[PDB]
Design a protein around this ligand. Structure first.
Ligand SMILES: N=C1N=NC(N)=C1/N=N/c1cccc(C(F)(F)F)c1
Ligand SMILES: [Co+2]
Ligand SMILES: [Co+2]
Ligand code: NA
Length: 263
């Protein structure tokens, strides 16, 4: 039975979502050729703890050792910040930030392209963000999550890309992952009719090549099986009476925070 957040809960999620977005805005000037992912993670954790007075939800989660996930190129998700891993020209990099503030979580991620983009990296990132945005435009009471997942998948596949099956968006609130699962592809098992006050993420992982993935022996890092590039963007939202409100919007987003479907 899916959680419905109160107005007071939603305001706390606005606060936490803003913090998560602000980590991404803060880190941008540091994402440059030559920086290590270990350094980026320290900058993020110091900011979260010392400036935001918040906590990373990733740190210690199932034993995860770092504060943000940083995934480069063929890494799909859960990449571990490493002092030895240096960013370089052409890399596509996801930074995924989840913070807890006043008991509530905010969860967001974006791609950064380092130095001169490669055209395929830029296209993959663009299509991935566009797939998130088309899903966000669909969210309103009465729509089924199945329709949203199906639409993401059709859009991505038409570009010759694929959707990763093993990971999904999620309800979010006092818990990091709550009901429902938010699949980014069509499934007969999905039957969730949205209601005002539901809060969840949408966070498609899109591969340039085939959909299959592999987890590395570190038990964390996930890569494309074919070593094709993979990209992801994520926002946390609340369903409103006539659409949704994005809780993790950044200045560089190009979709409005409040989406209304009323006349
Ligand atoms: N950073 C995230 N944003 N949305 C998620 N589902 C995220 N997953 N995060 C993690 C972070 C560390 C470990 C794991 C785990 F699932 F592998 F345990 C998941
Ligand atoms: Co996330
Ligand atoms: Co998430
Ligand atoms: Na990637």
């Amino acid at each position: 039975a899916i959680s419905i957040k109160t107005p007071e809960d939603i305001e706390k999620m606005r606060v936490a979502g803003r913090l998560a977005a602000e980590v991404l805005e803060m880190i941008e000037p540091y994402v440059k050729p030559g920086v290590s992912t270990g350094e980026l993670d320290r900058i993020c954790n110091d900011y979260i703890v010392n400036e935001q007075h918040a906590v990373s939800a990733c740190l210690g989660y199932h034993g995860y050792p770092k504060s943000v996930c940083i995934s480069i190129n063929e890494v799909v998700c859960h990449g571990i910040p490493d002092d030895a891993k240096l960013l370089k020209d052409g890399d596509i990099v996801n930074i995924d930030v989840t913070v807890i503030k006043d008991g509530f979580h905010g969860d967001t991620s974006k791609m950064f392209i380092v130095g001169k983009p490669t055209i395929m990296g830029e296209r993959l990132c663009r299509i991935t963000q566009e797939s998130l945005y088309l899903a966000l435009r669909m969210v309103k009471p009465g729509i089924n999550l199945r329709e949203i997942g199906a639409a993401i998948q059709k859009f991505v596949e038409a570009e010759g890309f694929s959707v990763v099956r093993e990971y999904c968006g999620h309800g979010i609130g006092r818990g990091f992952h709550e009901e429902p699962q938010v699949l980014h592809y069509d499934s007969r098992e999905t039957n969730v009719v949205l209601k005002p006050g539901m809060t969840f993420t949408i966070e498609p992982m899109v591969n340039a090549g085939k959909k299959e993935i592999r987890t590395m022996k570190d038990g964390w890092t996930v890569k494309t099986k074919d070593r094709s590039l993979s990209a992801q963007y994520e926002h946390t939202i609340v369903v409103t009476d006539n659409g949704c409100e994005i809780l993790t919007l950044r200045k560089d987003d190009t979709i409005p925070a409040i989406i209304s479907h009323d006349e």
